[PDB]
């Protein structure tokens, strides 16, 4: 290296809560130096040397009474001496406060590689590893932020208040770059992107359109490219001594009265492919720098929450303290962990608040709630099922094992699944449905980009360039342009029209956001629910059959009250509510009424 | 009508926890009357009474200081007279301690009617509204009380501990009296059956046989032709006045954050079919009737337990009431509930000392373990996926949501679903993997009779006739007879011999009853998993594929702690154990091995 090759974090901030300071610093025979700075409020720690000559980690304690500004670390050693300006930098007003998703948002998760290439010159960059190709599912497309900026006012228009998208920092890998997955760089956007500042603008572009940014981070693991595998920090960074062992995936293995320590190992510790080598969290120094790299990222992008990826993949007691660090930071985020399980236990184990068997304590408030988008899947695919939607309610039903459920991530759908309108069998009407059920379900929802265009995919197993085609649109020359309506089908724009609709009418319905809910049995694959609170009810009634079917009102009398009848809000139609509620085939309808004494 | 008609419960006991005892007494213008008594502990509270003439309910209270005894109570009104001797027994010494079923117990299931014909003549009972025909899958074949004693040294020498028969009390309807569950007169025994000291003889044979009497009690229903409906004790003792209001099931309602009053109410007080009337348990003499009646049978028939019916029909709070007054007397008792859900959470919500989101409190030790019995079946019989037994190992890993899942009962099968061998495809190999992992789980292991010479039935759907086919051999000239072995096929009496083996086995293995279980995620539909204490290690190992497997055993050696072999109990073959376990198609194994330190 020259002198000091990598420094991170590369800057702080000044007033954090926690007041220590961890630098990773690395260069040829840095580690055979010492540090030595005068600023005052900050201390320089007592060294603790690692073997290998090109790192040193150096500690600090960055005290409340040290100001924004700037000074040099001197490293010295063997009669020569190489110097950093460290930078602490004023926080913006407000941030430690910032408000995290919640509720009352509505998230649009993109692939950035796969939505918007708003510049064809970075689809390559000179010394990367992979080539791009619009042809391989597989390959890089070149979608970049420039792209995703470019389409905020669309975003925005559809009445989302955040954008998730997949993780944008560096993957030099010489294939499948293009996910994110496996980072090469945690602290540098990759360049096909765009830069850091690009990111950065991103996020205030966003704001100003009312918008909050969430990040989506990997802690388990890396890619096989990341340049800490030439020149291993320490022997154990790596687990399993840096060499492929793989994980077998027995997720219930940490959260299990009968496991077998060999499986709880092999779920954190085993490499998740062997082009992504697992980080040992159990090292102090790893742990740190996880966690200082994200809370990095929030304060520098001005992020309003994160997104984390592999979520029990990581070190059980490592994440109690990374939440704990995260939240202590900024009280007031939301971050919604991927525990890919369709087990309501399995899922609640991690949310904040709950009580374990074993007395595990997270910080995390928010997870992505697979279990139920898998119950509604069912219900909408199982057509040959006479009640399939009484999966739905009674995975609802279970809404008390989580301490918060109001706070979970609800989805159409995502990059790893089906698309959406495929999952209710390209039928419009049960696609209605599962698009109501998301808008109106005590939930946080969340979209993925192209299911408002009705975007297919294969069904089976897991396929996932399928999920992932590009954004009609996004590229110059494209005959569909979803951003402009050019070449969509009447159903394809009636679909990104309803979509507009009901999410930009789910940010003015404050009884969706944190209203009761009450839900009846489904019967025959009818089933009715409630949204309720002083100030409104909002009445949920679909059809699952192609059949019309007339359910007596009597049966709802505790929310209905009498009610003669209402308005539809989607066909604008009025229903009569009287003594029974006739129903079309495939139908659904969401009635607004006034508040109950 | 005869002065008086019924007089319930007929007796009582000097000594119990319990001292009221509310005497329900019917005949004509019984109402009209005022009861006296004298003896010596016993107090006559004083008449709270009901409209119908036909009907007194007489409230005591014996003081610990009443005495066995009689004494007569005398009814006087109207210028006439009534009187009753009514009787206190002294308890059985150790009545109150008596032992319940437990871990170390295994159960053998019968319905009464379709077991053992020990006496044709009773068959049909002069007066009753229903005709034997033993070729009605539904009828009445005439298997009674005597056929079950002749044949408790077969039960017992298969190494069953416990015999629980499907209900016996009086059922006569004109059609489907055969099964029990619509009682006619909860204080008598079906003729059809024979009488209630036969019941009691039952009882004390078992005894001395080494087995207990578990009783099937349902709480929620009788049958319509039930004395009562002629002349309602009160208004309100029948759900919906005595008219037919159909239950929808929705069993969630009950323990839902989420639930309309309309579905809970539903689920407890919707009459489960129109020959079932539902009844009021929310009205106190309903409640105590049936806390009576079921401590009755228990005292006078010597039961280790009961089996509980159609569970959660019943009214929340009556639940409470009659597990903590059913366990008040008798605390070491075993009471299982049939609370038919594959959903842990749902069973679990029912089990003492589970801390409930809504606070719902019970005394009930056990429930039926349907999760995990459909997670084998569904892993035995869906022979193309990879890995089946993973649903297995991710059900018992949710164990922690029961306070004592050692205490649930686990079972093969029963009289409502397919068989046993049909569910498994009638793959005999596998059928052994369900009875090995029946036999050696850390639960109270129940099996259907039948079972043990793989009996089929049809698997869609349901068909109950098809469940519950005679056994052979219960019926003189049967060209079969299970009981002496005569006519069996070399299947069948392989089938036989194998659960004799095990299940005489298991009576003497406490590892089982009361050690500890680790299990491994299941790889490629190969399942190891360890019962253990410092005496013994018990090491199962199946291979749920048509293909040989090889299992490295450095994974499974925190339990195996470089054991080099081992001797499978079924087979007596030394097994490998010292770098890998070779397992043949479609086998399993039972390896024991000296203690963990
Ligand atoms: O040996 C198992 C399996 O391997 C083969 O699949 C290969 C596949 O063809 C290939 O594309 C690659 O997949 C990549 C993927 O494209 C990337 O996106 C990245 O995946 C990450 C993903 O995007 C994240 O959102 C996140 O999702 C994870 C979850 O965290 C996990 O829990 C797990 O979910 C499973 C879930 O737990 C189960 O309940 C069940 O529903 O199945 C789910 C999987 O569908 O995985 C998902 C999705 O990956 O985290 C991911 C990792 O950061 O990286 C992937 C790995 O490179 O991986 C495969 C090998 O190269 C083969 O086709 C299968 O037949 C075989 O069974
Ligand atoms: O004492 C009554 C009954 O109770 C116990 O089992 C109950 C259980 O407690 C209930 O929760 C409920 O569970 C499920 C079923 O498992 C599920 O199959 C479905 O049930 C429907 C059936 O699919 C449908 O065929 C029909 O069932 C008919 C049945 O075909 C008839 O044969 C007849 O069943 C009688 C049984 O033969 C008799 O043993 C007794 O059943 C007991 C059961 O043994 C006991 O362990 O009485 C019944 C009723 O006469 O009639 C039924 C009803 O017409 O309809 C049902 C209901 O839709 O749904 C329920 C609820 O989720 O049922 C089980 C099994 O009966
Ligand atoms: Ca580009
Ligand atoms: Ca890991
Ligand atoms: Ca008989
Ligand atoms: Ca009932």
């Known amino acids: 290296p020259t002198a000091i090759e990598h420094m991170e974090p590369p800057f702080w901030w000044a007033g954090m809560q926690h007041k220590g300071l961890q630098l990773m610093v690395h260069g040829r025979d840095i580690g055979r130096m010492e540090a030595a700075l005068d600023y005052p409020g900050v201390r320089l720690v007592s060294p603790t040397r690692v073997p290998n000559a090109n790192y040193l980690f150096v500690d600090l304690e960055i005290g409340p009474e040290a100001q924004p500004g700037s000074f040099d670390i001197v490293f010295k050693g063997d009669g020569r001496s190489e110097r950093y300006r460290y930078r602490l930098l004023a926080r913006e007003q407000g941030s430690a406060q910032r408000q995290g998703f919640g509720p009352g948002d509505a998230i649009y998760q993109i692939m950035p590689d796969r939505f918007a290439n708003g510049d064809p010159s970075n689809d390559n960059v000179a010394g990367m590893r992979e080539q791009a190709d619009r042809r391989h599912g597989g390959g890089r497309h070149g979608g970049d932020i420039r792209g995703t900026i470019d389409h905020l006012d669309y975003i925005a228009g559809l009445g989302f208040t955040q954008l998730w998208p997949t993780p944008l920092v560096e993957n030099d890998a010489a294939a499948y770059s293009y996910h994110g997955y496996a980072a090469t760089d945690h602290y540098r956007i990759d360049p096909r992107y765009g830069s850091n500042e690009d990111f950065v603008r991103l996020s205030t572009e966003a704001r100003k359109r009312g918008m909050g940014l969430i990040q989506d981070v990997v802690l388990s693991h890396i890619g096989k490219h990341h340049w800490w595998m030439k020149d291993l920090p320490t022997p154990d960074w790596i687990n399993y001594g840096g060499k492929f062992v793989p994980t077998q995936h027995h997720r219930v293995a940490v959260q299990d009265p009968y496991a077998a320590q060999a499986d709880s190992e092999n779920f954190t510790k085993g490499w998740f492919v062997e082009g992504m080598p697992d980080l040992n969290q159990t090292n102090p120094l790893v742990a740190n720098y996880l966690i200082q790299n994200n809370i990095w990222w929030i304060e520098y992008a001005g992020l309003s929450g994160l997104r984390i990826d592999t979520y029990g993949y990581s070190d059980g007691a490592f994440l109690t303290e990374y939440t704990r660090r995260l939240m202590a930071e900024y009280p007031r985020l939301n971050m919604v962990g991927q525990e890919w399980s369709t087990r309501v236990p399995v899922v609640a184990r991690w949310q904040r608040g709950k009580a374990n068997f074993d007395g595990y304590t997270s910080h995390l408030p928010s997870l992505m709630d697979f279990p139920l988008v898998?119950?509604?899947?069912?219900?909408?695919?199982?057509?040959?099922?006479?009640?399939?939607?009484?999966?739905?309610?009674?995975?609802?039903?279970?809404?008390?094992?989580?301490?918060?459920?109001?706070?979970?991530?609800?989805?159409?759908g995502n990059h790893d699944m089906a698309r959406m309108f495929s999952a209710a069998g390209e039928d419009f009407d049960r696609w209605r449905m599962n698009l109501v059920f998301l808008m109106t379900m005590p939930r946080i929802p969340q979209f993925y980009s192209g299911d408002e265009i009705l975007m297919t995919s294969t069904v089976k197993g897991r396929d996932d360039a399928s999920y992932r085609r590009d954004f009609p649109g996004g590229w110059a020359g494209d005959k569909a342009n979803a951003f402009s309506g050019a070449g969509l089908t009447s159903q394809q724009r009636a679909a990104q029209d309803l979509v507009r609709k009901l999410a930009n009418w789910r940010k003015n319905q404050p009884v969706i956001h944190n209203g009761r809910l009450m839900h009846f049995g489904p019967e025959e694959n009818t089933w009715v629910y409630f949204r309720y609170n002083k100030d409104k009810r909002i009445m949920v009634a679909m059809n699952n059959n192609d059949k019309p079917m007339t359910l007596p009102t009597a049966r709802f009398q505790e929310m209905l009250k009498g009610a003669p009848s209402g308005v539809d809000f989607l066909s604008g139609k009025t229903v009569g509510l009287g003594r029974e509620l006739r129903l079309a085939p495939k139908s659904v309808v969401v009635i607004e009424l006034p508040g109950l004494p």
Do not use: C, H, I
Not at 374 to 401: H, I
């Open 374 to 412: 898998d119950a509604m899947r069912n219900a909408l695919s199982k057509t040959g099922e006479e009640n399939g939607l009484n999966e739905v309610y009674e995975t609802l039903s279970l809404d008390y094992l989580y301490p918060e459920p109001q706070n979970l991530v609800l989805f159409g």
